[PDB]
């Protein structure tokens, strides 16, 4: 449609699929998010990555 880009998520690296009947996008439904994940950001934020097979400290 031809509405305003008011949504809190405009410019998100994951695209949503929503429904709306108003000129303001933030009025839209939550829709469906995209299913990407990045566990490493929290679980493995090391500078020099080590393998599963290796001894972590060498």
């Amino acid at each position: 449609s031809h509405e305003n880009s008011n949504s809190a998520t405009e410019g998100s690296t994951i695209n949503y699929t929503t429904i709306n009947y108003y000129k303001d996008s933030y009025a839209a439904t939550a829709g469906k998010q995209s299913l990407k994940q990045d566990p490493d950001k929290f679980a493995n934020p090391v500078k020099d990555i080590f393998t599963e097979m290796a001894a972590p400290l060498k």
């Binding site: 839209a28 299913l35 929290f42 090391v46 599963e52």
Partner: protein
């Protein structure tokens, strides 16, 4: 123009945030691959070094002989919108007749959702959150009864005049948004955009809102983030005479189009006050259940 070498070769000004990780699509739980016995020197998946700060990289396949399993279990219900886009109670407003609090037929509620533990604990899992919201207002008498009464709800942003009576000129509402609805009608419901002057709301602000000496008397301001203060929600019975009925307005909030950053430990002590992490020092409890011995169930 630049001519000395250190200036030419410097990285001062690089605006690109070098990122070590990237997101991959993961719509289902990972599968399991067939594995067999490994009798090897040099290869040692089981041994880790937690000191590094990373979580173990060992997998089922490398610790036991596994079969192949095609896992089609979905990861959809654990998205931020799935977890948060469920309406929960964030405010209750009383409008009694003969009362100590609001006997004048109107009430002003400073928008702060930290008064109820269920909702609060969930949002406090993150430091910053950005989202839109759907607010629903459920009104009735204290017995849950529905009466033929007309109400006006008005959103008063910071700086707009807060009403001081059921007859305040501010109810003319020529610019603020107001909703007029009867108790007999279904709950009123509206959409709210992300309104902070900041890129996100933040449940934690380690600082002070102003400069100066931070003497004992202005210590109640530690942690106060004006960027989270969206204003006042005002409600009144619409009349020049007192209403015949006592009322209660319950406010529900459903977040949508959510983004969150910086996860943190989850609250493990009872909450005591709104937007302040104080806990009762004399009643510090363990996070969970306890037992008599470590060698017994």
């Amino acid at each position: 123009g630049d001519r000395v070498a250190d200036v030419i070769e410097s990285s001062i000004g690089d605006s690109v945030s070098r990122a070590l990780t990237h997101a991959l699509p993961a719509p289902t739980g990972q599968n399991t691959q067939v594995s067999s016995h490994r009798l090897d020197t040099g290869k040692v998946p089981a041994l880790q070094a937690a000191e590094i700060g990373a979580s173990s990289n060992a997998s089922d396949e490398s610790m036991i002989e596994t079969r192949c399993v095609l896992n089609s279990h979905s990861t959809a219900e654990t998205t931020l919108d799935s977890f948060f886009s469920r309406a929960g109670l964030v405010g209750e407003i009383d409008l009694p007749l003969k009362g100590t609090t609001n006997p004048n037929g109107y009430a002003n509620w400073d928008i702060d959702i930290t008064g109820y533990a269920q909702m609060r604990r969930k949002v406090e899992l993150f430091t910053y959150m950005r989202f839109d919201a759907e607010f629903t207002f459920v009104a009735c008498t204290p017995t849950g009864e529905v009466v033929p009464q007309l109400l006006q709800y008005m959103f008063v942003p910071p700086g707009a005049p807060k009403p001081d009576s059921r007859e305040s000129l501010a109810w003319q509402t020529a610019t603020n948004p107001s909703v007029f609805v009867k108790l007999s009608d279904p709950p009123a419901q509206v959409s709210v955009p992300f309104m902070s002057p900041a890129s996100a709301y933040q449940w934690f602000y380690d600082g002070y809102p102003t400069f100066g000496e931070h003497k004992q008397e202005k210590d109640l301001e530690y942690g106060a983030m004006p960027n989270n203060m969206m204003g006042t929600f005002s409600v009144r019975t619409v009349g020049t005479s007192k209403s015949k009925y006592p009322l209660v307005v319950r406010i529900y909030m459903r977040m949508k189009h959510v983004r969150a950053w910086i996860p943190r430990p989850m609250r493990n002590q009872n909450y005591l006050f709104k937007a302040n992490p104080n806990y009762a020092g004399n009643s510090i409890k363990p996070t969970g259940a306890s037992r008599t011995a470590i060698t017994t169930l």
